[PDB]
Design a protein around this ligand. Structure first.
Ligand SMILES: Nc1ncnc2c1ncn2[C@@H]1O[C@H](COP(=O)(O)OP(=O)(O)NP(=O)(O)O)[C@@H](O)[C@H]1O
Ligand SMILES: [Mg+2]
Ligand SMILES: [Mg+2]
Lengths: 448, 455
């Protein structure tokens, strides 16, 4: 029997219950002395009644998202205002995961008079990599703050600073001061350089999609901003730093290490991203004859262009022979064979020829058209190559199929990786991984 | 003996004369096969008559500046359109130093019709860190190109792109084509990424105030642009690169290595490094008591060691008594007339924190091993700026953040306060320097309105 965590009250929760809840929302943490995630909005009383009413009654958000669950109780503690690093993909309530703590923090002090907002600048600074993201964050924030202003004592001003707005307009928009400022690093820097604003009173600094900011070349801009806010800070100000990234990198570690003080580290969900629409089908075949006999009826069912990958030029030639003499399909080869190979590609792109049989080397950096079918006649040594290969189909929202023949002579570790992959990336719910391959390589037998 | 270079024809100049001329304008060069600098605008006939007329009569520059002297003959040098790295301050006249060569180069081909400018993009691209500089550069260039356009068939469009510009506005600005594009790097990247222009034909690329571009954080954007320019160039396009900086750094060196080919290197004047990260604070005070009253909360918050400068020894004794009576800071005094033993004792107390505050008169601390201090206080400013600069030198040493606080009364020389305001406005690495309104009003200094919304 038992009693499930959703049936318990807070007191009754044990450590196994917390483990289960964390798994339930794919939250993984570390850093020591980590607060448990919210079970709901209400019970810890972290969120003040007015704000809570805005969230539950006005916006109708009955429950927190995972990232909000873990972020809010770790970032809201008058005790610590501890730093936070979250690894989570865009969306799923990330923005309010950090905007809610900023509001809570604001509501634990009397409202700043307007004149003071003008003299002192923002209490929160949010950095994001693009104008679009910045504007999206401002709107998502004002969604709450616009209502909150009508339902409480706080009149929160959200100003954004982005490319495409003159220094003059930025300066004008700052006329009634600012509580939360949202900016791209570049334009924020342009703004400081022209003395448009002071940031001596910033209590929460947020770095959102930090990996994307690094990717776009903003590392030095970001670290300059961090250093500048640290130096210019009023000494009575205590500043909390929050960082969100979809992935972890050496650069992100470097920044965390350099600018954050003993932070909570959390992973939330998995790294999201594009799923090619591919049916992966892995089948066992003893030798090249068996392979070809299984392949023949498959190609009969797929519209050209079709591509077949091999590893040895001899096998390519053999396979072309088989196709030419045993079906009515026109092929073309690719090694180390042609420099005018773009002739062949041109045959293929225009459907003069239906099947291309190519090695990895020969086909890398060629514009292959979207194919209906990839055949891995000989498996690659590296998963990188398998992924690049099968990527030749399933592009631009069309469905594709990738069939791979696995013999008795393949790298076991590779086959393990491939099994995991075929299970994990199954958007069409139709991926096949042969039981015979499972047996030959002792892989994928275990139940969940 | 020998006749002085100013008395000679160009063809009579020997190597010693060139050495002397270069020392006269503080020009130092390397990189091999460096051309001699201009002795005047006219001699060499590098600059065509109409353009020279504009420069002298219209822009009012009868003589070239040192950076112009060395830059122009090294980048306008058929046969080789050589790359160039100049180390020089604003405002040493850099702008014309690179604009003159761009125009001269432009004048060698027929004007392009707008449709073709659009198809191929600018012939010259100039990068600068701020809107203010980009707009300056565009204005200076346009003074010439306006004239060139009215008085000849050369329409030559000089477009600026800055961070503040919407894609709409950039589009409209680019709508009749562009010959010289002056841009901030981030926004240039946004423009390219949105297909607002191309860059197949950039023959001259100028990176102005490159050290500042790096300091603001733009190294990757600049690199990305250099790369894109080089990648999209037509085959027959030779791209000449000029880079100007106020200081030399390993990053600048690295960019020169990666993106320039056998450049001429030149330094004008005494090369300086980065500015000490000192915050300078100038504050008003009616008298000494009031100075001390403002000083109490200040020395309460800065970590020892702290150094305080005065002009008269009597003031040192006074100050020391007040520190003893009103603070918990212990002090040592150098007034100038103690033994080297005593002065070394004092200095030892100071270095080992047995005392927190050293009080020194104008030259009592010169030549001694004063540790880096967190705070320098000018209790009585010196009569001369040299001493001010020397004193604030005691802080912000070795890449540290430093603070210098000066109190002025109404008894100072007005010209000194004027110089001081200039110095405090000019040297503000941290954009945090404070020059009190009280001092401004009392001396009628720094009260000139800019007549600009932003500047
Ligand atoms: N706890 C919550 N419960 C329900 N919905 C929420 C919660 N938090 C946020 N949302 C909303 O769920 C939607 C999807 O989340 P998310 O993608 O993060 O928002 P967003 O993309 O930043 N804002 P938007 O572009 O207007 O959809 C948004 O409209 C959020 O405001
Ligand atoms: Mg969304
Ligand atoms: Mg770097």
């Amino acid at each position: 029997m038992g009693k499930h965590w959703t049936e318990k009250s807070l007191h009754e929760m044990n450590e196994r219950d917390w483990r289960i809840l964390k798994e339930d929302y794919a939250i993984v943490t570390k850093g020591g002395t980590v607060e448990n995630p919210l079970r709901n909005w209400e019970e810890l009383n972290i969120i003040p009644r007015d704000l809570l009413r805005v969230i539950i009654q006005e916006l109708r958000f009955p429950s927190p998202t995972p990232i909000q669950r873990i972020t809010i109780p770790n970032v809201c503690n008058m005790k610590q205002y501890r730093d936070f690093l979250g690894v989570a993909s865009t969306g799923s309530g990330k923005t309010l995961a950090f905007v809610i703590p900023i509001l809570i923090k604001m509501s634990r002090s009397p409202p700043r008079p307007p004149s003071l907002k003008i003299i002192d600048g923002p209490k929160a600074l949010i950095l994001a990599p693009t104008r679009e993201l910045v504007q999206q964050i401002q709107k998502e924030t004002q969604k709450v703050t616009k209502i909150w202003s009508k339902e409480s004592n706080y009149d929160c001003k959200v100003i954004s600073i982005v490319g495409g707005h003159s220094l003059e307009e930025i300066s004008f928009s700052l006329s009634e001061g600012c509580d939360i400022l949202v900016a791209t690093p570049g334009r924020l820097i342009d703004s400081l350089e022209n003395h448009l604003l002071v940031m001596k009173q910033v209590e929460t600094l947020v770095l959102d999609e930090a990996d994307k900011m690094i990717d776009l070349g903003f590392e030095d801009q970001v670290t300059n901003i961090l250093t500048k806010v640290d130096i210019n800070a009023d000494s009575a100000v205590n500043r909390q730093t929050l960082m969100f990234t979809a992935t972890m990198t050496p650069v992100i570690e470097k920044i965390a290490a350099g600018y954050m003080q003993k932070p909570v580290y959390a992973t939330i969900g998995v790294e999201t991203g594009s799923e090619p629409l591919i049916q992966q089908v892995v089948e066992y075949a003893d030798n090249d004859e068996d392979k070809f006999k299984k392949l023949k009826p498959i190609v009969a069912k797929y519209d050209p262009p079709i591509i077949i990958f091999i590893n040895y030029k001899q096998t390519a030639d053999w396979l072309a022979e088989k196709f030419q003499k045993e079906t009515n399909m026109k092929v073309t080869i690719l090694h180390k064979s042609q420099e005018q190979r773009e002739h062949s590609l041109q045959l293929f792109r225009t459907n003069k020829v239906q099947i291309m049989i190519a090695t990895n080397v020969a086909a890398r950096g060629l514009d292959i058209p979207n194919v209906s079918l990839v055949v891995n006649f000989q498996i690659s040594k590296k998963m990188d190559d398998y992924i690049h290969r099968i990527g030749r189909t399933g592009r631009a929202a069309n469905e594709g199929t990738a069939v791979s023949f696995v013999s008795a002579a393949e790298d076991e570790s590779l086959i393990r990786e491939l099994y995991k992959y075929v299970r994990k990336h199954d958007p069409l719910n139709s991926n096949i991984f042969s039981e015979a391959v499972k047996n030959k390589y002792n892989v994928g037998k275990q139940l969940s």
